[PDB]
Amino acid sequence: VLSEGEWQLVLHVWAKVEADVAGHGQDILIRLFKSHPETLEKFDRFKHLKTEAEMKASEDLKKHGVTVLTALGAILKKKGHHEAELKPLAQSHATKHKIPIKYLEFISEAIIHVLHSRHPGDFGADAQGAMNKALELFRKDIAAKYKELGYQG
Ligand code: HEM
């Protein structure tokens, strides 16, 4: 469970992200696909992209980045009381998109790195630890739903 002070750190930096949701979404998905190329292969929508320049030129990738970060921001602003938001996301990620929990660990690392590059004065070590706790809680609660449905591994 995060404390109130840890939530304030998370949401203080997230309010900065929301000034440029689309740029953050591009940076995060690009980092995920470059650092873990097995993730790109899960997207029939993006697996034609073969260079970082092609990724940065894709308007559809930039649109989906906004879809992903809008869904994460709605979860973070619930401060843990996010059951209604995780149900459909776990259901689609486990049963339709076939995304292992481990790949949610990878996108979490990408989100932390991009928040650190873009917001250093609001993403010191205290806020890095609190965001890592928030992203752990997201993964823990999704993994419980995966396990229900037979997909934890
Ligand atoms: C912070 C973690 C993530 C969030 C909030 C998120 C959010 C979303 C949302 C809101 C959608 C569209 C609605 C739906 O299908 O449920 C979606 C689609 C999808 N996501 Fe994620 N997702 C995350 C992580 C990942 C990861 C790590 C992967 C793959 C490595 C992935 C693969 C997919 C795929 C393949 C689609 C369908 C794209 C399409 O063809 O339209 N997701 N995601």
UniProtKB/Swiss-Prot annotation:
Residue list for modification Phosphoserine: S3
Phosphothreonine: residues carrying this PTM: T67
Subcellular location(s) per record: Cytoplasm, Sarcoplasm
GO biological process assignments: removal of superoxide radicals
Keywords for this protein: Cytoplasm, Heme, Iron, Metal-binding, Muscle protein, Oxidoreductase, Oxygen transport, Phosphoprotein, Transport
Known catalytic reactions: Fe(III)-heme b-[protein] + nitric oxide + H2O = Fe(II)-heme b-[protein] + nitrite + 2 H(+); H2O2 + AH2 = A + 2 H2O
Residue ranges constituting the Globin domain according to the UniProt record: 1-147
Subunit structure: Monomeric.
Protein name: Myoglobin
Species annotation: Physeter macrocephalus (Sperm whale)
Lineage, top ranks: Eukaryota, Metazoa, Chordata, Craniata, Vertebrata
